[PDB]
Design a protein around this ligand. Structure first.
Ligand code: OJW
Ligand SMILES: OC[C@H]1O[C@H](O[C@H]2[C@H](O)[C@@H](O)[C@@H](O)O[C@@H]2CO)[C@H](O)[C@@H](O)[C@@H]1O
Ligand code: CL
Length: 514
């Protein structure tokens, strides 16, 4: 699918893509390979869809948080630099692109949100979120506003949500302990909604609108990354880059990104991508090219980071980096952000309350692990005759009642529909691991191509139980957890919005409740 003798690169449109294309041109110089840089809308969403069919770009650039998802789905080549090259980048930048002990990308640069302020409007920027309503009242009398930043991407609101005890996954990383709807997070997002309610911010404010307002000198402050600094430089606003305000005395905790370059597993040009990234981009000359288009932040390349470390804007970036936490790269990061995006937009717009909205985000962020636990437990106890002794952990009442419900309703389906199950199981030839990976592909297709309701969800999980019974029978128990993950995966990928609407597994318990 991907053309050979070429490199197609995706990078996000807020980055220095003209600069990366200049590195592209210098690679063409030496090698006669053309390099196309593109910056599609929603490339973090489009990359996994197209790569899954052996398509998309050779190289994708994104923050490291998405790359584990991509790696889990087998969409990235293992990268294998020598020690000599590894030692040119900071050990911690490598750690951000390590998934199941394999390097899955080249780290490029460390990114944290800072408070950006207009020195001519605000000589001393505020130290606390609490003083911003006063400062806004004061600035409005002079025809200005205190603060405008992008309220459409949860990334920009995360530092306030994290400040007083909000977290995605507790720290390796425990995917059973999600802190999206705890007191700390409610307080953070409540402060934001109050700012909006009291007219100190507008729910509809996005990246464009905030950027234009700061750069015309209408607002005294914005929250943004190093990529933003080029446009402000050009607007001749006298700006400073500082530490974010505290909330309830606690520092703002930004989620730190490492801009990372992955190589599509479907690429016929992997050697070229490695050569480009290792010997063209990740050089003093290579990164300088890009950094002049749009600043990268604290670059991963020690040699060039020593140069830029002297910049007080980088020093403030690093200061904000250390008050915050480096993002997880676990596959569930994608579901976490989709849930928290939706919570922030609906709290901001008043379509839900803070409590309603963060509850729905807690369900969304937990949904995959909650679903896997129930489904894999049902499959294993169906196959073996014996229930799993281990405790269900957090939200363990929901898992226990869902499993107990599924036992009654799933046994009923398997009993009544045994004919078609034996029939469909015989029509397929389950004999080995490779046959199991095939069966997954079919279920995904059959489930996906039909209406959403609890009966069809029980039927998918009940057929899985049926198949798990058989897999045990042919000494193939090892393939039962992969089968559970496949059923879990399609269920929460394709029916996420419906499951959150039904209050997830509590709705399942309620719907089939005697
Ligand atoms: C299990 C199944 C599904 C089927 C899946 C399947 C097929 C093959 C693989 F790998 O997954 S995944 C899946 N996920 C959800 N629903 C499925 O099937 C149902 C319909 C259905 C289906 C079967 C049993 C109970 C069934 O009852 C569904 C039911 C019970 C209560 N409410 N509902 C909607 C739905 O999609 O609505 C299915 C789909 C079709 C099926 O049979 C069609 C007839 N066929 C004739 C030839 N013979 C040799 C084999 C059987 C069967 Cl047996
Ligand atoms: O809004 C959630 C979003 O946050 C991060 O994306 C950042 C990115 O890291 C930055 O490089 C810059 O481009 O801004 C983006 C936010 O608009 C996560 O990396 C991303 O996965 C997530 O969707
Ligand atoms: Cl409101």
């Amino acid at each position: 699918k991907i053309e050979e003798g070429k490199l197609v690169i995706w990078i996000n449109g807020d980055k220095g893509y003209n600069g990366l294309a200049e590195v592209g041109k210098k690679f063409e110089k030496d090698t006669g390979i053309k390099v196309t840089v593109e910056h599609p809308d929603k490339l973090e969403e489009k990359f996994p869809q197209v790569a899954a069919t052996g398509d998309g770009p050779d190289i994708i650039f994104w923050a490291h948080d998405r790359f584990g998802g991509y790696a889990q789905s087998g969409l990235l080549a293992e990268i294998t630099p020598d020690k000599a090259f590894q030692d040119k980048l900071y050990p911690f930048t490598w750690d951000a692109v390590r998934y199941n002990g394999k390097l899955i990308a080249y780290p490029i640069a460390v990114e944290a949100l800072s408070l950006i302020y207009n020195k001519d409007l605000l000589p001393n920027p505020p130290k606390t979120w609490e003083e911003i309503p006063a400062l806004d009242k004061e600035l409005k009398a002079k025809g200005k506003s205190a603060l405008m930043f992008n309220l459409q991407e949860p990334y920009f609101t995360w530092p306030l949500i994290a400040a007083d005890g909000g977290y995605a996954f507790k720290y390796k990383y425990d995917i059973k302990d999600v802190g999206v709807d705890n007191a700390g997070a409610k307080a953070g997002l409540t402060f934001l909604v109050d700012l909006i309610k009291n007219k100190h911010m507008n729910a509809d404010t996005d990246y464009s609108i905030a950027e234009a307002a700061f750069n015309k000198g209408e607002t005294a402050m914005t929250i943004n990354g190093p990529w933003a600094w080029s446009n402000i430089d050009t607007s001749a606003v006298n700006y400073g880059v500082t530490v974010l305000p505290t909330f309830k005395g606690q520092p703002s905790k930004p989620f730190v990104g490492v801009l990372s370059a992955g190589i599509n597993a479907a690429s016929p040009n992997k050697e070229l991508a490695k050569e480009f990234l290792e010997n063209y981009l990740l050089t003093d000359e290579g990164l300088e090219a890009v950094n002049k288009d749009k600043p990268l932040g604290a670059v991963a390349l020690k040699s060039y980071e020593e140069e830029l470390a002297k910049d007080p804007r980088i020093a403030a970036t690093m200061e904000n980096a250390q008050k915050g936490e480096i993002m997880p790269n676990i596959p569930q990061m994608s579901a976490f952000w989709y849930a928290v995006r939706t919570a922030v937009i609906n709290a901001a717009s008043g379509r839900q309350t803070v409590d309603e909205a963060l509850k729905d985000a807690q369900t969304g962020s937990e949904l995959y692990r909650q679903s896997l636990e129930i489904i894999s437990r049902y499959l294993r106890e169906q196959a073996t005759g014996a229930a799993d002794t281990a405790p269900m952990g957090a939200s363990g009442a929901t898992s226990r009642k869902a499993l107990e419900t599924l036992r009654r309703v799933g046994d009923g389906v398997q009993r009544n529909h045994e004919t078609a199950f034996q029939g469909m199981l015989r029509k397929l030839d389950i004999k080995n691991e490779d046959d199991v990976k095939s069966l997954s592909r079919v279920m995904i297709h059959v489930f996906s191509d039909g209406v959403t309701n609890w009966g069809r969800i029980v039927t998918l999980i009940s057929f899985g139980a049926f198949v798990a019974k058989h897999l045990k029978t042919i000494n193939q128990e090892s393939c039962i957890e992969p089968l559970a993950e496949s059923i879990t995966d399609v269920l929460v990928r394709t029916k996420r919005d419906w499951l959150v609407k039904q209050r997830g597994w509590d709705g399942f318990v309620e719907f089939f409740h005697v």
